[PDB]
Amino acid sequence: SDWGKRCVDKFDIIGIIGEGTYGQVYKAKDKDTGELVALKKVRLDNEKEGFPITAIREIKILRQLIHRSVVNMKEIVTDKGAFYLVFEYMDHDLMGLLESGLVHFSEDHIKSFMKQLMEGLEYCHKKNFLHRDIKCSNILLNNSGQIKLADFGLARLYNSEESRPYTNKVITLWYRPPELLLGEERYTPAIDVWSCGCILGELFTKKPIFQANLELAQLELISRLCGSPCPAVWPDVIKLPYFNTMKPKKQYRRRLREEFSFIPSAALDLLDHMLTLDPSKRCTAEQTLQSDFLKDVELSKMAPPDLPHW
Amino acid sequence: TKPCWYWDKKDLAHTPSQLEGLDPATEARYRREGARFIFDVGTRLGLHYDTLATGIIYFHRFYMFHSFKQFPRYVTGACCLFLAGKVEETPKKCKDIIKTARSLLNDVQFGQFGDDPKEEVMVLERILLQTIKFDLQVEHPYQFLLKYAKQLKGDKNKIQKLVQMAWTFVNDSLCTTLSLQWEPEIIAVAVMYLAGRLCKFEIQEWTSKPMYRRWWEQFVQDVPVDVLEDICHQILDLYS
Ligand SMILES: CCn1cnc2c(NCc3nc4c(F)c(F)ccc4[nH]3)nc(N3CCCC[C@H]3CCO)nc21
Numbered sequence: 001s002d003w004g005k006r007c008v009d010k011f012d013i014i015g016i017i018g019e020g021t022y023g024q025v026y027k028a029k030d031k032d033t034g035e036l037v038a039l040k041k042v043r044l045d046n047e048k049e050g051f052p053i054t055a056i057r058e059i060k061i062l063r064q065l066i067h068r069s070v071v072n073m074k075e076i077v078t079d080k081g082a083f084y085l086v087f088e089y090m091d092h093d094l095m096g097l098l099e100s101g102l103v104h105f106s107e108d109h110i111k112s113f114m115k116q117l118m119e120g121l122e123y124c125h126k127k128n129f130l131h132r133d134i135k136c137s138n139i140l141l142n143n144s145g146q147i148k149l150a151d152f153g154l155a156r157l158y159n160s161e162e163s164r165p166y167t168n169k170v171i172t173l174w175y176r177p178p179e180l181l182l183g184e185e186r187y188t189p190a191i192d193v194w195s196c197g198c199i200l201g202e203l204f205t206k207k208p209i210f211q212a213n214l215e216l217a218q219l220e221l222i223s224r225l226c227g228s229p230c231p232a233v234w235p236d237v238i239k240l241p242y243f244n245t246m247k248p249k250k251q252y253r254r255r256l257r258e259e260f261s262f263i264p265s266a267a268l269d270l271l272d273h274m275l276t277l278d279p280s281k282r283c284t285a286e287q288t289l290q291s292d293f294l295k296d297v298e299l300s301k302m303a304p305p306d307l308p309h310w
Numbered sequence: 311t312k313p314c315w316y317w318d319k320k321d322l323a324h325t326p327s328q329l330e331g332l333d334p335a336t337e338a339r340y341r342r343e344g345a346r347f348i349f350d351v352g353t354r355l356g357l358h359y360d361t362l363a364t365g366i367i368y369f370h371r372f373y374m375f376h377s378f379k380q381f382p383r384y385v386t387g388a389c390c391l392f393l394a395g396k397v398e399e400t401p402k403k404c405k406d407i408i409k410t411a412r413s414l415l416n417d418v419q420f421g422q423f424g425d426d427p428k429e430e431v432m433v434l435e436r437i438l439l440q441t442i443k444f445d446l447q448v449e450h451p452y453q454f455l456l457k458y459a460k461q462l463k464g465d466k467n468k469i470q471k472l473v474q475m476a477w478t479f480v481n482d483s484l485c486t487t488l489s490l491q492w493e494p495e496i497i498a499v500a501v502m503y504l505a506g507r508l509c510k511f512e513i514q515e516w517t518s519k520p521m522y523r524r525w526w527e528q529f530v531q532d533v534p535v536d537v538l539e540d541i542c543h544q545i546l547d548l549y550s
């Protein structure tokens with residue numbers, strides 16, 4: 001339990017794997033155990049306000065989460081000055097794989113990944129945490145076919161008892177839900193489920209399903225597939241700040257089921273429910289797990305996928 | 311799992327400061343002074359009770375690992391408040407903590423900060439973080455006093471008086487090493503118990519078991535009366 005005292009020189013730094021919010025992410029090796037790890041650097045020097053409030057939030061959250069599908073911070077180490085958060089090294093991330101064009105995910109692979117992602121998400125949500133940065137690069141996968149939800153840099157505690165105001169510009173654009181694009185600030189864990197619906201769809205098409213550069217363009221792309229936001233499907237939409245300002249081009253009908261007819265029916269039901277415009281009608285993480293697609297997925301009985309040992 | 315942040319009275323007699331020859335009375339004084347300084351600085355900055363208490367808990371824990379002979383108390387106090395502000399989402403600029411400290415302390419007391427007071431605090435933050443082992447989340451007696459007093463059913467005016475007095479006792483407890491000895495849930499019950507005694511209130515009469523003497527057993531498990539008494543004595547010692 002004695003964190004922060006072990007030195008970083010106890011690790012051999014192999015190379016940079018990522019850019020982090022408050023420092024680089026490194027692949028490294030434990031000199032004593034030989035184990036591969038990831039090191040997330042937290043730079044202190046030349047910070048006006050010292051140890052970053054951002055890292056403080058992340059550390060507070062990480063220490064409260066123990067779940068097999070969620071990243072688990074082993075210890076915090078110091079320079080011989082920066083600090084380094086230590087995690088088990090994961091062979092891949094979803095983005096890299098999907099971009100390698102070396103992998104194809106079977107329906108069985110998808111079920112397994114989704115089952116694990118949603119179980120991790122559900123765990124966080126039940127702990128009253130909003131992730132707020134779900135995307136492919138933040139979902140880690142090992143060669144054993146084990147998934148981990150990563151990057152709690154933007155996560156925050158959410159008041160389930162009574163509504164509170166939160167930061168609106170969260171989630172990378174492509175995975176950002178309609179309520180945020182429309183300016184909601186008293187949003188819910190539903191924002192993360194929308195992000196996951198985007199991953200689900202992306203797993204089937206191998207391309208991000210909504211690709212726009214700006215918010216209005218993003219809302220229009222969402223509208224084109226899911227239908228235009230309107231009171232008929234989303235009564236409370238009229239209460240959102242940008243509802244009149246940001247209006248799609250035509251009043252689109254939902255053609256999600258047509259566009260993704262190539263997807264298996266049970267996967268498609270789940271996708272439909274996850275990409276439901278009205279956050280109050282969008283399924284919860286607990287509900288995804290009770291869907292036809294996931295309810296009978298027996299993880300122990302699944303073959304690992306064929307991932308490169310790159 | 312998580313570090314143990316509780317010590318014996320035998321352990322509290324063997325702090326790094328006593329090992330360096332600081333007598334026990336002087337250490338208690340240094341702690342009262344450091345705690346009251348965090349409370350005073352923080353109050354002037356409009357910080358509220360949880361941030362002040364977190365700052366104070368970090369301060370007391372720090373001195374279980376370091377000596378007052380090596381680490382000037384007000385510098386550590388300022389540093390603990392600064393960190394606590396970030397942890398509790400009520401941040402304050404280090405500049406402003408220094409300015410308030412300059413105003414509250416005499417020239418000798420403020421001498422502790424050296425030539426670059428802000429740098430003195432910032433440099434310590436790395437050490438403080440390592441010392442508290444990155445265990446940032448801390449719960450205080452306040453929330454439990456409120457949660458427990460809410461479940462009390464009886465005369466509104468007496469219950470309010472019990473709580474107001476108990477709250478004052480929590481503020482006092484922060485000056486002692488009580489937070490290094492007992493969990494916040496137990497300190498909360500002890501302050502209710504002390505307030506009830508001084509007010510001559512029968513708290514068991516406000517419960518679902520008016521005939522049951524150990525009214526606190528619905529709030530905390532297996533806490534003997536001698537533990538509550540001990541805590542009471544320690545709080546009362548501040549008034550002696
Ligand atoms: C949570 C900390 N943690 C533990 N294992 C990993 C991990 N393993 C997959 C991997 N990817 C690589 C890569 F891209 C390279 F170039 C070289 C080597 C790689 N290894 N990847 C990432 N990141 C992947 C994108 C950068 C940031 C983070 C996102 C989440 O923190 N974080 C990880």
Ligand SMILES: [Mg+2]
Pocket residue numbers: 021133151153
């Ligand atoms: Mg991020």
